[PDB]
Every structure is written in structure tokens, then in C-alpha cells.
Amino acid sequence: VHFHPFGNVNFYEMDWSLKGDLWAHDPVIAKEGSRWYVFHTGSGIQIKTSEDGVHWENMGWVFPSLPDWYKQYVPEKDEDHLWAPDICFYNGIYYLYYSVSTFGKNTSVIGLATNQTLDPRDPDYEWKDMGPVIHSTASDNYNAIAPNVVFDQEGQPWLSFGSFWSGIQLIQLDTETMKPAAQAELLTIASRGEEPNAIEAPFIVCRNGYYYLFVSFDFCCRGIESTYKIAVGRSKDITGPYVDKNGVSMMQGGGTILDEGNDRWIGPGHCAVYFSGVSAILVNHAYDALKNGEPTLQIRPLYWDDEGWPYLSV
Numbered sequence: 001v002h003f004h005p006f007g008n009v010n011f012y013e014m015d016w017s018l019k020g021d022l023w024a025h026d027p028v029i030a031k032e033g034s035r036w037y038v039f040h041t042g043s044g045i046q047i048k049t050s051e052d053g054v055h056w057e058n059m060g061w062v063f064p065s066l067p068d069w070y071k072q073y074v075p076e077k078d079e080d081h082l083w084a085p086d087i088c089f090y091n092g093i094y095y096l097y098y099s100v101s102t103f104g105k106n107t108s109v110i111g112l113a114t115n116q117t118l119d120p121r122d123p124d125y126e127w128k129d130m131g132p133v134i135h136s137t138a139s140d141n142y143n144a145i146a147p148n149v150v151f152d153q154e155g156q157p158w159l160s161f162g163s164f165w166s167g168i169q170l171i172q173l174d175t176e177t178m179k180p181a182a183q184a185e186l187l188t189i190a191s192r193g194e195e196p197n198a199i200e201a202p203f204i205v206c207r208n209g210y211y212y213l214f215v216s217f218d219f220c221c222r223g224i225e226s227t228y229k230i231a232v233g234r235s236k237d238i239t240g241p242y243v244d245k246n247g248v249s250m251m252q253g254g255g256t257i258l259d260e261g262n263d264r265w266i267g268p269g270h271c272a273v274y275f276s277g278v279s280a281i282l283v284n285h286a287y288d289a290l291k292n293g294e295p296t297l298q299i300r301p302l303y304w305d306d307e308g309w310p311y312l313s314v
């Protein structure tokens with residue numbers, strides 16, 4: 001994956017017994033040179049760095065002070081937590097999308113910050129506020145949060161996002177601006193078909209002629225009472241229809257459950273998937289039942305069966 005570079009590493013041979021500062025929620029990962037980076041939800045977007053991808057250390061944040069334009073979209077927001085960042089590398093630039101919102105409401109806006117490098121030691125290191133990408137108002141039937149960028153086989157960048165309301169949305173981005181055209185069509189590609197519609201945090205990857213849509217089912221943010229689950233569906237066309245193993249459309253609650261946790265790791269969710277050579281990893285957070293349900297970073301090797309469906313090992 002050119003936009004999610006990891007080259008020169010086999011995730012399947014590594015020991016993923018994470019150590020260090022592992023508190024995280026809605027994480028994504030990027031690697032530049034010998035340095036690994038984690039971006040996740042928190043004040044001004046929290047960052048963690050690692051030498052091997054296993055031992056993590058907190059490394060500050062993206063926005064020391066929130067851009068004033070946030071108020072034009074979410075005037076009621078009072079605190080400085082920015083949610084569910086997404087990172088990708090294109091044309092020598094790092095594109096970091098994130099969410100500005102308030103819990104339980106859809107008055108939200110997805111923003112974009114860019115940097116020439118992820119290394120704070122480099123003279124070119126500077127997170128630039130490149131403004132809003134797409135937003136939702138109370139009158140909209142969707143929620144503009146939890147972005148994920150994917151470049152299809154033809155090199156066309158697409159932005160997927162969404163949480164509750166109508167569900168998962170999809171829209172084309174322009175390669176130059178990396179923002180959707182003013183007249184771009186917004187497409188709904190997945191929904192539980194229930195009320196409330198508990199589906200969010202989309203992440204799309206392409207593997208062997210298929211596009212896989214990973215999403216999170218049910219409830220996050222409730223500590224050991226979270227009911228988060230990771231589900232997946234696929235399609236030959238990035239615009240859908242995404243269908244699960246049983247042939248059920250993801251627009252009708254379809255989705256094959258990849259992980260629903262256990263009595264030790266509660267509600268795993270808001271995932272990300274990365275590849276390297278022939279290996280792949282599943283990234284997400286889960287609530288620690290042994291530690292007051294604190295959200296913890298999880299990285300595990302992700303395999304793919306003969307049918308091409310992903311699965312976690314035992």
C-alpha cells in the first residue's frame with residue numbers, strides 16, 4: 001500500500017506483546033524510516049512513537065491550540081479532544097484527517113492537517129491546519145466523524161466515514177486538494193438498518209481484487225460495559241455493494257464478526273488494517289477489564305483464508 005508504507009517488515013514474524021504507554025482510543029498507525037507512530041483520540045490529537053512498533057511512548061499532540069474555524073461548525077464544543085484521526089502518505093505529504101464533534105450529536109466536521117514529515121526532529125516538521133473537509137449539521141441524516149482514506153486500484157482517493165444516523169458514508173476526493181469536489185456525491189454504503197443504527201469507524205483496504213470494509217458494531221465508550229465488535233464485508237467495486245460471508249448486504253446489517261472480545265478484553269473496536277509484503281496487522285483499542293476498563297492499544301497479526309476472508313489467530 002503506497003499510502004500506508006511499512007515496507008521491509010514481516011508482521012507475522014514479530015512479537016506483538018505491546019509495552020509502554022498503551023492508553024489509546026480509535027488509533028491509526030504510520031511508519032516513516034525506522035520510526036513508528038500512533039495517532040489517536042484525545043486533546044489536540046494524541047501521538048505515540050515507537051522504534052519497533054512494540055514499545056510505545058507518548059509523544060505530544062498535533063494541535064497545541066484548536067483552530068478557530070471549529071466553532072463555525074460545532075459552536076457548542078467546549079473541550080479540546082479531537083477524535084478518530086486517520087493517516088496516509090501521498091506525494092511526499094502526510095494527510096491526517098480527524099473529527100471535531102460532541103458525543104451523541106451529529107453537529108460535526110472532519111478536518112485535515114498536513115505535514116511534510118512525522119519526525120519532530122526534522123526542520124520541515126509542522127502540522128498545518130488545512131481546514132474542513134466535510135461536515136454534518138443536525139438536519140443531515142449522517143454524522144461527519146471517523147474518517148478513513150483509501151486509494152482504489154485506479155489511484156482514485158476515497159474518503160469513508162460515519163457514525164450512527166444513516167450509517168457509513170463514502171465520497172470521492174480530488175488528488176490535488178485531497179478534499180471532495182463541492183458537487184461530489186455522498187454515498188451510504190453500510191447500515192445496521194436498526195434504530196439506533198450502531199455502526200461506525202469505517203476502514204477500507206483492497207486485497208486481491210476485493211475491497212474490504214471493516215466497521216465497528218454497537219457501543220464504545222462505556223468501559224467494561226462497552227459492546228463494541230469488529231465486523232467486515234467486501235465488494236469488487238469500492239462503491240459497493242459490500243456483502244459479508246453469508247451473502248448479506250452491509251446496508252441491511254450484514255457483516256462478518258472478526259472480534260467481539262472476551263472477559264479480559266472488552267469491546268474491541270475502531271480498527272485499522274495495514275499490510276507489509278504478504279503480512280498484515282489489525283489495529284484497534286479494547287477496554288481493559290483488569291484496569292478499570294481503560295481503552296488500550298491492540299496490534300495483532302491478521303491472516304486471510306483461502307476464500308480471502310481475514311481472521312485473527314489463536
Ligand SMILES: OC[C@@H]1O[C@@H](OC[C@@H]2O[C@H](O)[C@H](O)[C@H]2O)[C@H](O)[C@H]1O
Pocket residue numbers: 101102103104105143163164165196197200220
Ligand atoms: O461514537 C459514538 C457516539 O454516539 C453516536 O450516537 C449515539 C446516539 O445514537 C443516535 O444517533 C443519537 O442521536 C445519539 O445520541 C455518535 O455518532 C457518536 O458521538
Ligand SMILES: [Ca+2]
Pocket residue numbers: 026027028084085086146147148201202203270271272
Ligand atoms: Ca478510524
